[PDB]
Each structure stands twice: as C-alpha cells, then as structure tokens.
Amino acid sequence: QTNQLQYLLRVVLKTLWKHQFAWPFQQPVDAVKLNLPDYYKIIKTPMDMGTIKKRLENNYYWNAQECIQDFNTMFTNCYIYNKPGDDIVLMAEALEKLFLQKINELPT
Numbered sequence: 288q289t290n291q292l293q294y295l296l297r298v299v300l301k302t303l304w305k306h307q308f309a310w311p312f313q314q315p316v317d318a319v320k321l322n323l324p325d326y327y328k329i330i331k332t333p334m335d336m337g338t339i340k341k342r343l344e345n346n347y348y349w350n351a352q353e354c355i356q357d358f359n360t361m362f363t364n365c366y367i368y369n370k371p372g373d374d375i376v377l378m379a380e381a382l383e384k385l386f387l388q389k390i391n392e393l394p395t
C-alpha cells in the first residue's frame with residue numbers, strides 16, 4: 288500500500304514462503320545435518336527467508352534496500368555453493384523470478 292518494508296513482509300515474503308520450492312530456504316542451511324564442512328567457509332554471509340522474516344518482524348532493517356540485498360544474498364549464496372543445473376539451483380531460480388515479479392509492484 289505505502290511503506291516498503293510492510294509490503295516486503297505482507298506481500299513479497301508471504302508469496303515466496305507459500306511457494307512449493309520455499310522449504311529449503313525457510314531456515315539456515317544446517318551444514319552439520321547435511322554433511323557440508325566447507326559451506327560456512329565458502330559462504331561468508333549466509334541467508335534464508337527464515338532470518339529475513341525475523342528481521343522484518345524485529346525492525347532490524349534500516350530500509351527496504353537492505354532487506355532486498357538479503358534476498359539477493361540468499362539466491363547468489365545458493366548459486367555460488369551449488370553446481371548450475373542442481374535441483375536446489377532450479378528451485379532458487381524459480382523463487383528469484385517470482386521475487387523480482389513481486390518487487391516491481393513495490394510502493395514509493
């Protein structure tokens with residue numbers, strides 16, 4: 288409607304969260320459970336919709352552009368660590384496309 292961060296929480300995040308392919312990005316990549324010793328060495332700034340959701344609820348972000356940066360970090364993190372063509376990458380790509388659709392309808 289008017290405030291940007293409100294939009295990001297109530298519209299953008301809700302849409303991405305409901306999506307079929309959301310579940311692997313709803314919490315930090317648990318690198319112990321998954322047997323990934325190198326993840327937290329390669330990915331300097333980890334990110335998930337879980338953490339973004341927390342930050343929107345907890346008046347953490349200075350402004351919408353900081354939150355959008357985190358969404359991009361989540362996607363690019365996935366594309367850095369994983370081989371192009373992997374299942375997880377196609378899922379990230381699907382969410383990214385939808386993310387960018389919803390970001391165009393953003394108030395100002």
Ligand SMILES: Cc1cc(F)cc(C)c1Oc1ccc(C(C)(C)O)cc1-c1cn(C)c(=O)c2cc(-c3cnc(-c4ccccc4)[nH]3)oc12
Nearest residue numbers: 310311312314315316317320321323364365368369374375
């Ligand atoms: C989405 C998905 C499908 C699948 F069939 C198998 C896995 C591991 C998978 O990814 C995850 C499943 C669960 C979780 C939880 C919820 C436990 O955190 C995370 C992932 C997962 C999420 N993200 C964002 C990743 O980038 C990633 C990478 C891996 C991964 C696990 N093992 C590998 C891998 C390592 C070396 C060689 C080949 C694959 N990659 O798993 C995930």
